[PDB]
Design a protein around this ligand. Structure first.
Ligand SMILES: Nc1nc2c(ncn2[C@@H]2O[C@H](COP(=O)(O)OP(=O)(O)NP(=O)(O)O)[C@@H](O)[C@H]2O)c(=O)[nH]1
Ligand SMILES: [Mg+2]
Length: 166
């Protein structure tokens, strides 16, 4: 069966792991647990297709920035995650996108932009500005809450749709 290799990227603390663990394990992790690099896999149904989703969950922290090139080689699609209450994370998106393109030697790598933590009243990044960013990249935008699981499947499964359409 098709295996889609998805890589979750973005600044520290935005919810990469929370998104990942929601998808794979159906639990919200409220714990503080910075990532170095973790791999997950789950058989899922996407648009009727029973397939394997591999997720590589990556570090947002400064010190595991040198690891990026390797995982950006190997991934097929990238969830570029920021948090809608953290405008710095939204700005940091651009650097993750550019790095992915550099490594893959391609301006058109399967990606999605994900505004996570939409459950939080304290939004600082407007949905419109994030849609606009995604549009400037020619990729889908998905808003999510890893807390409630709202949009979680949408985020990973829209990325699988991008990989299929490349
Ligand atoms: N309210 C809310 N909190 C969230 C959401 N997603 C993650 N969090 C919380 O935000 C904190 C950091 O989330 P985590 O998944 O560790 O982020 P990360 O991007 O994987 N961190 P790292 O870059 O260090 O690996 C955790 O306390 C987590 O519970 C969300 O959608 N809503
Ligand atoms: Mg993490």
């Amino acid at each position: 069966m098709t295996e889609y290799k998805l890589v979750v990227v973005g600044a520290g603390g935005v919810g990469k792991s929370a998104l990942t663990i929601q998808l794979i394990q159906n639990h919200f992790v409220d714990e503080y647990d910075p990532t170095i690099e973790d791999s997950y896999r789950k058989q899922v149904v996407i648009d009727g297709e029973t397939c394997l989703l591999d997720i590589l969950d990556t570090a947002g922290q400064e010190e595991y920035s040198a690891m990026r090139d390797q995982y950006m080689r190997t991934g097929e699609g990238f969830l570029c995650v920021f948090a809608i209450n953290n405008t710095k994370s939204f700005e940091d998106i651009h650097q993750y996108r550019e790095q992915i393109k550099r490594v893959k030697d391609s301006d058109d790598v399967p990606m999605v932009l994900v505004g996570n933590k939409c459950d939080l009243a304290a939004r600082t990044v407007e949905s419109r500005q994030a849609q606009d960013l995604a549009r400037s990249y020619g990729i889908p935008y998905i808003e999510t809450s890893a807390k409630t699981r709202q949009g979680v499947e949408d985020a990973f499964y829209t990325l699988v749709r991008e990989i299929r359409q490349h």
